[PDB]
Structure 1
Amino acid sequence: QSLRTLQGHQSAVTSLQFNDNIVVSGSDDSTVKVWDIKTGQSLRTLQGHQSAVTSLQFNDNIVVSGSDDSTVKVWDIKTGQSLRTLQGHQSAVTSLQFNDNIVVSGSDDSTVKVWDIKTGQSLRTLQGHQSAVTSLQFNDNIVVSGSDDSTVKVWDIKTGQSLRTLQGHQSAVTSLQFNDNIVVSGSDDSTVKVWDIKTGQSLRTLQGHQSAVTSLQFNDNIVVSGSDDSTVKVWDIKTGQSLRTLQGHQSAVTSLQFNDNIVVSGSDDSTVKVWDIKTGQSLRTLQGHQSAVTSLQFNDNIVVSGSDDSTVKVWDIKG
């Protein structure tokens, strides 16, 4: 069931992230909007971007967004003003992640750039990729980046060098997740690969998808991936076997998220689907979107989804 349909975005919503009392949405209208999830009304419209917003991340005080204008901006989430503009990328910024000290941005110019968040200076520039960087993730020591060059590269977050290059994918890498033990990468070649992060060798290749893999997520036991073949698949990470295939969507799966109990997926068929992961059976179909679903996020009881119809919708996860 839909509770609140947030409105005021004039173009497709690309990214979102919500807490207990606010939602932060990025869209193709070059604006970032802050809303009150309870009332469903807009508080602040963050302006300064000259093209579509591709990703975002916020904490209690700060919002960090990436846009198609090759800039990463840092916003005060309460006053609505822009604090820093980070300039160094020469093409669209596709992914971002930031902590207390630094921000890390991936771009179409095949470079990952590290910036000390309170300075705005370009600390490091990670060179090595031959095409657009699509996804990234870093911890205290290292950075793992995916790119259109069909390779996943590991870097040292402070030395600025490349540690390993994970090779085997025959098409662009779209998503990645990693721990100190392994990395998990999805690619356009319809395969998900599990690698040993320490040595950079391929531990397994998950096969079964008939088209590009768009999103993934894994815990200690399982990998959950969504593909362009309108299906979500469950895998066993150590075995490499296919566990369950979730079938209900009639178009490509774009975003997903899961826990020990359920799997919440978004697709281009304008529907968000909640499934019991143990069964592999659909529990609900969230309807109300008039166009493709681009991003989602859920907690214990509600789901927040963004769609191409320039709307952000809140859903009761099981009501």
Structure 2
Amino acid sequence: TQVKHMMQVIEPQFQRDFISLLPKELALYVLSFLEPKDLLQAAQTCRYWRILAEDNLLWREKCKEEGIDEPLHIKKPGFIHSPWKSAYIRQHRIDTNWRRGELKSPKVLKGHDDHVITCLQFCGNRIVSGSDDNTLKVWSAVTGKCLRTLVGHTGGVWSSQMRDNIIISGSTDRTLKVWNAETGECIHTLYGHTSTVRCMHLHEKRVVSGSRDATLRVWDIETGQCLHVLMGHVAAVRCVQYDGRRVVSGAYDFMVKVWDPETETCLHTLQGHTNRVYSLQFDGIHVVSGSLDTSIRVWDVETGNCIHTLTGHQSLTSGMELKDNILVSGNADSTVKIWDIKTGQCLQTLQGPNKHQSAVTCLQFNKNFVITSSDDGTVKLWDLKTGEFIRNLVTLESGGSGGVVWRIRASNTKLVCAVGSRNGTEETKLLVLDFDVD
């Protein structure tokens, strides 16, 4: 369709081989059985194969394979480059750039001096850092300059959410605040909690908040009013999930509760953890809970039955990510585990000779890599598929004498790291690492 152009315009020398002599459509069919590594090699045999191995609908299919789903445009005997091939190649380069590309020194965004970064958001090109310094800061992931400082809270910030230009914050001052991320202006102060606002989860137009007062509150992000109050927990509420339909909450009362928010009704009390529930994941079908009991329970939301209780960690499960029934759990036992929550299999433990030396503070993952951060001052890249250590993405000099990495967000091309120390050996700051190509 678009390869006939190149044929009758870059007239290639006659070829005496098998695929140059097939009807174009049949050569394309044959070349469609190859993997990109081999299509990429074939393109280098001769001018005829190069033109044929750049068919758009050949690569639209390979990109759909690796979940690309979006072409790349870049506005001498010339060439009509495929956007789906540029899209595929670009991704493989970003991948190899994370895995083994030289680490260009990061942008350092200094702020929240001598305090803790307690929450991190990363949204397009904006970063939001929250702190016990009472403030939040909005940054540009591109320039590294501080754009705004969200001042108004009388106590320390301890949770946050970000949709798009709306920032939600939680503080020890018992209040949540709705913010405009461009203007820096606070547009609502949400009153109702009687204790510190510990967690929050935003789904579209509503944020659910958990407090040290043992309650949850559902709020309208636009009208700034408080729609519901979920009462039933007996100790502080530490984690919360909200999919638009149920609220799932975990607390220091050893319990996980499932709610219907509209009716304010507790549908299920999930019982089994023998210590505080500290982290939660919910995909509308399964709720996944991690506790100081060293266990991670997988529950069925619609019945409240416990499907799996996943054992093996030895300490608090600090963070978890759930995606397509793959669970990644980080722990204070200095260990990251990849679980298959369909079968309960523990697919991998990340514990090399290059294992973390302190607790895991944060993690992120995608189809290729797990990214982990720790008290040891490091952020490590791991191969999801093999469980193997790849490399240290960050290695604070102060890691062993006080320097810690509190939190990471990753995009497809950048890594953001919240870094600091309780003892002054690390000035507190964000690090931005760029893994893009051209």
Which shifted more, 287-296 or 26-35? 287-296
Q: How far, CA to CA, are the matches of 1:82 and 1:194 in structure 2?
A: 38
Q: CA deviation at 1:317?
A: 5.2
- Return closer, same or farther for 1:219/1:103 CA change in 2, 3 Å cut-off: closer
- Return closer, same or farther for 1:129/1:56 CA change in 2, 3 Å cut-off: same
- Equivalent residue for 2:390? 283
Q: How far, CA to CA, are the matches of 2:193 and 2:386 in structure 1?
A: 45
- Return closer, same or farther for 1:318/1:186 CA change in 2, 3 Å cut-off: farther
- Return closer, same or farther for 1:289/1:132 CA change in 2, 3 Å cut-off: farther
Q: CA deviation at 1:155?
A: 0.4
1:263 to 2:263 alignment: no
- Equivalent residue for 2:121? 17
Q: CA deviation at 1:173?
A: 0.9
**Superposition pairs of residues 67-146 of structure 1, within 5 angstroms:** 67-146=171-250
- Equivalent residue for 2:430? 312
- Return closer, same or farther for 1:129/1:289 CA change in 2, 3 Å cut-off: farther
Of Structure 1 and Structure 2, the greater strand share is in 1
- Equivalent residue for 2:279? 175
- Equivalent residue for 1:7? 110
CA contact (8 A) 1:14 1:27 kept: yes
CA contact (8 A) 2:245 2:261 kept: yes
1:240 to 332, 337, 344: 344
CA contact (8 A) 1:96 1:106 kept: yes
Q: How far, CA to CA, are the matches of 1:115 and 1:22 in structure 2?
A: 24
Which shifted more, 282-291 or 158-167? 282-291
- Return closer, same or farther for 1:216/1:317 CA change in 2, 3 Å cut-off: farther
Q: CA deviation at 1:318?
A: 9.2
Q: How far, CA to CA, are the matches of 1:266 and 1:76 in structure 2?
A: 30
1:223 to 299, 324, 327: 327
CA contact (8 A) 2:123 2:164 kept: no
Instruction: Give the SS at the match of 1:129.
Output: coil
Which shifted more, 189-198 or 220-229? 220-229
Q: CA deviation at 1:12?
A: 1.1
- Equivalent residue for 1:272? 379
CA contact (8 A) 2:230 2:261 kept: no
Amino acid at match of 2:324: D
Q: How far, CA to CA, are the matches of 1:169 and 1:317 in structure 2?
A: 40
Query: How big is the alpha-carbon RMSD for the aligned residues of Structure 1 and Structure 2?
Result: 1.6
Instruction: Give the SS at the match of 2:182.
Output: coil
Number of residue pairs matched?
A: 319
1:148 to 2:256 alignment: no
- Equivalent residue for 1:58? 162
CA displacement 1:3-61 (0-9 Å, x = unmatched): 21111212111111112321111012011101111111111011011122111112323
- Return closer, same or farther for 1:63/1:221 CA change in 2, 3 Å cut-off: closer
Q: CA deviation at 1:135?
A: 0.8
CA contact (8 A) 2:283 2:322 kept: no
- Equivalent residue for 1:295? 407
Q: How far, CA to CA, are the matches of 2:261 and 2:364 in structure 1?
A: 27
Amino acid at match of 2:107: R
Q: How far, CA to CA, are the matches of 2:322 and 2:381 in structure 1?
A: 17
Q: How far, CA to CA, are the matches of 1:48 and 1:32 in structure 2?
A: 10
CA displacement 1:73-122 (0-9 Å, x = unmatched): 01111111111110111111111122443221111111001122222222
CA contact (8 A) 1:271 1:289 kept: no
Q: Please, which runs of 5 or more residues in structure 1 have no aligned partner?
A: none
Percent identity at matched positions? Answer: 50
Q: How far, CA to CA, are the matches of 1:99 and 1:224 in structure 2?
A: 22
CA displacement 1:258-308 (0-9 Å, x = unmatched): 111000111111111110111211212112374222221112222111123
Which shifted more, 304-313 or 132-141? 304-313
Which shifted more, 77-86 or 116-125? 116-125
Instruction: Give the SS at the match of 2:106.
Output: strand
Q: CA deviation at 1:232?
A: 0.4
1:191 to 2:309 alignment: no
CA displacement 1:151-196 (0-9 Å, x = unmatched): 1100012111100011100111111111232111111111111111
TM-score (norm. length: structure 1): 0.96
Higher-Rg structure is: 2
CA contact (8 A) 2:163 2:204 kept: no
Instruction: Give the SS at the match of 2:153.
Output: coil
CA contact (8 A) 1:14 1:307 kept: no
Amino acid at match of 1:212: L
